[PDB]
Tab-separated table of C-alpha atoms in Angstrom:
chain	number	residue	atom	x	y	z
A	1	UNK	CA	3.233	-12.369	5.642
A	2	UNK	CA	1.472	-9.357	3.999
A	3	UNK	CA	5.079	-9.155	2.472
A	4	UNK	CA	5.105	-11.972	0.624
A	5	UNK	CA	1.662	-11.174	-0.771
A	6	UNK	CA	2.511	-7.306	-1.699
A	7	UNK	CA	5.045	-9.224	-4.366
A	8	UNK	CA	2.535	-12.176	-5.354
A	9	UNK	CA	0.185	-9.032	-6.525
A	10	UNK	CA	3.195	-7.369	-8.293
A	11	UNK	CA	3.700	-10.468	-10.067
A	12	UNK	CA	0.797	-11.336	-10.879
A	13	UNK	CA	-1.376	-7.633	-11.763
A	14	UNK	CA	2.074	-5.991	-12.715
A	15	UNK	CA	0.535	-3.267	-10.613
A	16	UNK	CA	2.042	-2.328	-7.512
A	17	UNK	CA	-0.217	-3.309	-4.208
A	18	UNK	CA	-0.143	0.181	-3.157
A	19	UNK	CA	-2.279	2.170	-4.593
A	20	UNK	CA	-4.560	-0.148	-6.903
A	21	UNK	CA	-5.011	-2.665	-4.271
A	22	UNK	CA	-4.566	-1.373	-0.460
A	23	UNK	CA	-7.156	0.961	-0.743
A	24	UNK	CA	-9.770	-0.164	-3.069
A	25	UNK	CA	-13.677	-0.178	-2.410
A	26	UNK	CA	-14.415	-1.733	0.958
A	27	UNK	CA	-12.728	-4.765	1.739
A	28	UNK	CA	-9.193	-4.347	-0.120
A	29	UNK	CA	-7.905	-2.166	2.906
A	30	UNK	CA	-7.047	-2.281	6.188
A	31	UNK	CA	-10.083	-3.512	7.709
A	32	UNK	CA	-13.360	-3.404	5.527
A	33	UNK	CA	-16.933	-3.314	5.955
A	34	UNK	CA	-20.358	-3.448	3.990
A	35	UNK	CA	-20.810	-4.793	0.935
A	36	UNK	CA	-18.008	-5.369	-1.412
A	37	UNK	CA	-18.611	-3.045	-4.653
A	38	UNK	CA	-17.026	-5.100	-7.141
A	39	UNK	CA	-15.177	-8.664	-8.069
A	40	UNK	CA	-12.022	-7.123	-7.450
A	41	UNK	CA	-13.281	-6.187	-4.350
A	42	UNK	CA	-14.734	-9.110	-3.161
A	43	UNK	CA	-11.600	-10.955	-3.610
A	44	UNK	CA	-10.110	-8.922	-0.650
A	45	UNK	CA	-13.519	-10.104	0.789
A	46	UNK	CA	-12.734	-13.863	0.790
A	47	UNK	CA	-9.075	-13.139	0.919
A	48	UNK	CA	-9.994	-11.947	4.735
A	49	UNK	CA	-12.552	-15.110	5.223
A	50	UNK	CA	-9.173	-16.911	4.160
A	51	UNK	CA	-7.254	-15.250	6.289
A	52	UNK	CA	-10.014	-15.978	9.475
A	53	UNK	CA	-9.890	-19.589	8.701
A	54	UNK	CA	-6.467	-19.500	10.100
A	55	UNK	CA	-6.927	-18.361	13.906
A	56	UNK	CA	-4.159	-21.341	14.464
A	57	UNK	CA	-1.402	-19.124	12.607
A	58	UNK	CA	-0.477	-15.200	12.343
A	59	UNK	CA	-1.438	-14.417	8.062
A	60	UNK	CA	0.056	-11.111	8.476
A	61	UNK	CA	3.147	-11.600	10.241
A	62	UNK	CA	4.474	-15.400	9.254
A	63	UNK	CA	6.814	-14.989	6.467
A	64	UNK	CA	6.908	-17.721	3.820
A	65	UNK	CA	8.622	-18.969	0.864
A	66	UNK	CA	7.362	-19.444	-2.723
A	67	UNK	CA	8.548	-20.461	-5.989
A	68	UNK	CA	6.999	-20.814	-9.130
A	69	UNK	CA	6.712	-23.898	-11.991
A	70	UNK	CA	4.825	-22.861	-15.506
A	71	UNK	CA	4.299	-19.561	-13.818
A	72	UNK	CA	2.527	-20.274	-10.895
A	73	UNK	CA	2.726	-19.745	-7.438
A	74	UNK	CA	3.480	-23.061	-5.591
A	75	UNK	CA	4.022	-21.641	-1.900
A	76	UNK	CA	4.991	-25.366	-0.727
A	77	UNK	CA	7.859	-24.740	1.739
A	78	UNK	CA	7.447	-24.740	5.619
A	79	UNK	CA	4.844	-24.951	7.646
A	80	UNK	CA	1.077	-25.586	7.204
A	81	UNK	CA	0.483	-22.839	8.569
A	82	UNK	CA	2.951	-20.826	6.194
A	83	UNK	CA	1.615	-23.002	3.648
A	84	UNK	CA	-2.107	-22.119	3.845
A	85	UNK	CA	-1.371	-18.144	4.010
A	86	UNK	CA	0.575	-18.730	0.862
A	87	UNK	CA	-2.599	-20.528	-0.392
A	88	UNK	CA	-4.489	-17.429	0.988
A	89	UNK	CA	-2.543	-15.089	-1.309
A	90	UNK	CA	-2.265	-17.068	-3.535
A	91	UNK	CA	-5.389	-16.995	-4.352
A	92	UNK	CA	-5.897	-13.577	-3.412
A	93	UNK	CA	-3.482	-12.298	-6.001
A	94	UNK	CA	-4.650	-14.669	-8.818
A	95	UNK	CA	-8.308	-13.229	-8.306
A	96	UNK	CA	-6.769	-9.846	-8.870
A	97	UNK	CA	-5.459	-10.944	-12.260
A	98	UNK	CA	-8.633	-12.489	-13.163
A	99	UNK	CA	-10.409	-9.102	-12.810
A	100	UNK	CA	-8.165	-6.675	-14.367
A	101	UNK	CA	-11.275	-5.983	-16.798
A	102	UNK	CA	-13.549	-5.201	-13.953
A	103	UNK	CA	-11.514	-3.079	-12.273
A	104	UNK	CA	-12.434	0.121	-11.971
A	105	UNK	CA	-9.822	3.395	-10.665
A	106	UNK	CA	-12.625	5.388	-8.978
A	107	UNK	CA	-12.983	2.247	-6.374
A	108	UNK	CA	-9.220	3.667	-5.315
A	109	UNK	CA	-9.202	5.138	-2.182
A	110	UNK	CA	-13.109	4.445	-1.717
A	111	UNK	CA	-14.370	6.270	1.184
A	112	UNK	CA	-15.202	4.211	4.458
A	113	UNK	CA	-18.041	6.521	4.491
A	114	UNK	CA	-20.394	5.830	1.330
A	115	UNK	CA	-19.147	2.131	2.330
A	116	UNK	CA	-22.553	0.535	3.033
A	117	UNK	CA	-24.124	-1.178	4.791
A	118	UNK	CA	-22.148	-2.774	7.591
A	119	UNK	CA	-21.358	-5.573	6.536
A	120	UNK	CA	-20.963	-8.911	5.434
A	121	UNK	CA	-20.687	-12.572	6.869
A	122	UNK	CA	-17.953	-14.990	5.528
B	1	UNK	CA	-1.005	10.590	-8.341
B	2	UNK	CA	-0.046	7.917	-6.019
B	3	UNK	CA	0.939	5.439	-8.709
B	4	UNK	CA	4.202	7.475	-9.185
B	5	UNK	CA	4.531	7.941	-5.931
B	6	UNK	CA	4.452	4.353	-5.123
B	7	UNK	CA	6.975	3.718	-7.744
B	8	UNK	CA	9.404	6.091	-6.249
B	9	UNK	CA	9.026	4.450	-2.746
B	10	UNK	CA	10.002	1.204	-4.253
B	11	UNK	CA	12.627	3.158	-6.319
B	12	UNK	CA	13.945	5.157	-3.205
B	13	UNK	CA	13.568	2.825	-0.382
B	14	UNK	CA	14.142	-0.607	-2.406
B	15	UNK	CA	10.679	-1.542	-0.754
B	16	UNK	CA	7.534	-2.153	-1.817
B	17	UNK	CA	5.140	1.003	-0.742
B	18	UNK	CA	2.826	-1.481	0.736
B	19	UNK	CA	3.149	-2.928	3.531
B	20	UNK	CA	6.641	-1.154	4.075
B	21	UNK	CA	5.255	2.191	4.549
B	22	UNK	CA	1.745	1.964	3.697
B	23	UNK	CA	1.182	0.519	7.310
B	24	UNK	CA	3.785	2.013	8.979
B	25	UNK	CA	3.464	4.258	12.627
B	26	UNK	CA	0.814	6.254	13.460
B	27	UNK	CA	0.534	9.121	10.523
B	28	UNK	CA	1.394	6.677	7.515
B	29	UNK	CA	-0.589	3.869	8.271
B	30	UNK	CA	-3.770	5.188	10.045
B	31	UNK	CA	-4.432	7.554	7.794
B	32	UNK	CA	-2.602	10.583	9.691
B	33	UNK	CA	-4.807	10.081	12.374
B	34	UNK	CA	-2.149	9.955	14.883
B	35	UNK	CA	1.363	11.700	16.071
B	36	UNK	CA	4.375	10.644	13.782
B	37	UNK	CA	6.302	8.380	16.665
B	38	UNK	CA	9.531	8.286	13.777
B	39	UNK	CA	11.652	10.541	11.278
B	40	UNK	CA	10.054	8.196	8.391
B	41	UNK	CA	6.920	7.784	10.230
B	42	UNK	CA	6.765	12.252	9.779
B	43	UNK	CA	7.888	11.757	6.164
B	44	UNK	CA	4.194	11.562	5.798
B	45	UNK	CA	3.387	14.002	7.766
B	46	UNK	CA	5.562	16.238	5.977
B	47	UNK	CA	4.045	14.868	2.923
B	48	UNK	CA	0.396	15.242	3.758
B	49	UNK	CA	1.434	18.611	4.327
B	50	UNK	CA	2.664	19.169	0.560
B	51	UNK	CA	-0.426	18.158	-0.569
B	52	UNK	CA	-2.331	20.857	1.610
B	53	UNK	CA	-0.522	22.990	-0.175
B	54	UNK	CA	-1.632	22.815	-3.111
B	55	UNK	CA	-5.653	23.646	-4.160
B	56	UNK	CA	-6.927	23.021	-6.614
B	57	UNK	CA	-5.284	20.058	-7.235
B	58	UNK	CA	-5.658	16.604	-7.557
B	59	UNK	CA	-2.423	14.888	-5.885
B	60	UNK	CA	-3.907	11.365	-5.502
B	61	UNK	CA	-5.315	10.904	-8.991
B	62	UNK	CA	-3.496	13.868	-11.433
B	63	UNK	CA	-0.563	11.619	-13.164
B	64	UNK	CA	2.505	13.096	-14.127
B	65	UNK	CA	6.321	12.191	-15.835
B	66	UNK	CA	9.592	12.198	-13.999
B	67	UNK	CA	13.068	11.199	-15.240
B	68	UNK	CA	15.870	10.037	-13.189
B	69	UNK	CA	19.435	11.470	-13.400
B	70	UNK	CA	22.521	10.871	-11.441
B	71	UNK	CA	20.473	9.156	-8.501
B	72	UNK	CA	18.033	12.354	-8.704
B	73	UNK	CA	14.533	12.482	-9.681
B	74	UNK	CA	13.665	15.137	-12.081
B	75	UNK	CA	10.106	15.781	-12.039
B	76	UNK	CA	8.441	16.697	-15.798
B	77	UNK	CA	6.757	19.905	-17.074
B	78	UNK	CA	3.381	20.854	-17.204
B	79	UNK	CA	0.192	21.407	-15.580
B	80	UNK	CA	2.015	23.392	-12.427
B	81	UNK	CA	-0.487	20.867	-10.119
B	82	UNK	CA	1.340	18.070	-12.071
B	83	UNK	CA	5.055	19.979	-10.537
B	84	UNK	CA	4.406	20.370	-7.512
B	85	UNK	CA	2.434	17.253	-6.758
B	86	UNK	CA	5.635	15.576	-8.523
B	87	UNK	CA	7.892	17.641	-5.525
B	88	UNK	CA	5.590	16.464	-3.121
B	89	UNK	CA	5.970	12.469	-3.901
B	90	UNK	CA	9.416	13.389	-4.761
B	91	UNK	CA	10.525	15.133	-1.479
B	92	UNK	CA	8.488	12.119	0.644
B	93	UNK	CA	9.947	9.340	-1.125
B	94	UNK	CA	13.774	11.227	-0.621
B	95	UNK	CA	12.842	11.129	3.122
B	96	UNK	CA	12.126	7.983	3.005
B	97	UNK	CA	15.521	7.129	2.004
B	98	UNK	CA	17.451	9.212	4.093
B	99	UNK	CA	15.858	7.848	7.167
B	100	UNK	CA	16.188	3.905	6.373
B	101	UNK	CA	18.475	4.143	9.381
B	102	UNK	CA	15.589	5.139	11.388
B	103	UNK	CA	13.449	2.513	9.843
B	104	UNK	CA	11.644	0.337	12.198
B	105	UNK	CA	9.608	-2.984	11.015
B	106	UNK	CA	8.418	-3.454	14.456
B	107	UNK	CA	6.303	0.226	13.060
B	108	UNK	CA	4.635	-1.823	10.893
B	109	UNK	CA	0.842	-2.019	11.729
B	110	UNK	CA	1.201	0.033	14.539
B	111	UNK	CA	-1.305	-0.567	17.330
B	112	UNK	CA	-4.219	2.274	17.241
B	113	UNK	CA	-4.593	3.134	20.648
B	114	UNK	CA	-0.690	3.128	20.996
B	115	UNK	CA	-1.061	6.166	18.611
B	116	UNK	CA	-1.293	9.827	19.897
B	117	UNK	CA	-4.503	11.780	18.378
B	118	UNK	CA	-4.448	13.597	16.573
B	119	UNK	CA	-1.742	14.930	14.596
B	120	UNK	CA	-0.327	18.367	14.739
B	121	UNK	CA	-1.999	21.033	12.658
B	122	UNK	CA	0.656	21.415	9.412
């Protein structure tokens, strides 16, 4: 679920997923358009492609279960499709910690508006 | 700013702000476009309403200190902005809490159209 993934960015940015990552530039928030500003951004950006490669499951809803080896995420539990929305955030989250250095706090809570230009195929 | 306040969600409600309450009714999660439908769904409401407030201030970004006595949040001195913002976050993350037996998940990611706009005036 989106659950699941809220911890998976806690544990992985050591920043909580509200506010540095729910409403950042304009793809990393409920329901983006345009371009995506930067690579933290764009993560949300193929984090949603991820997420529409999946019409067989429900990303948001299906809860999962994940564990973790030499510190990282396994998410190898129950179903495939539990297992490839794990992979989702998975990778999702990991791009967040790969950009900490990019990331910029004026992309919080970046406007819809100013968000252009409508938008961006997967 | 809304770092602290997401830290005293997760302190208060033993949840993480997102998707908890991030995403939650009509006024939390659709950026109070809508009628509260719950008592934690108006939390935000009530909230949003601190915020208004207070001019010129700079709730979402202005960080401040708070401490933590016998269960109680005790916000830190300073820039009065940096106060009462505090008591905003403070008093909305309380409500929170007190109305966990109100709590619906089925709130979660609440259907738009469901929602009643907009809001009442504060």
């Amino acid at each position: 679920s989106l659950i699941e993934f809220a911890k998976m960015i806690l544990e992985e940015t050591k920043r909580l997923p509200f506010p540095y990552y729910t409403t950042y530039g304009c793809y990393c928030g409920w329901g983006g358009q345009g371009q995506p500003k930067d690579a933290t951004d764009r993560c949300c950006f193929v984090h949603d492609c991820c997420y529409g490669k999946l019409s067989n499951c429900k990303p948001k809803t299906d809860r999962y279960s994940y564990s973790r080896k030499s510190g990282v995420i396994i998410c190898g539990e129950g179903t495939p499709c539990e297992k490839q929305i794990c992979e989702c955030d998975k990778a999702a989250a990991v791009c967040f910690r790969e950009n900490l250095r990019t990331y910029k706090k004026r992309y919080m809570a970046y406007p819809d508006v100013l968000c252009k230009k409508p938008a961006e195929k997967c």
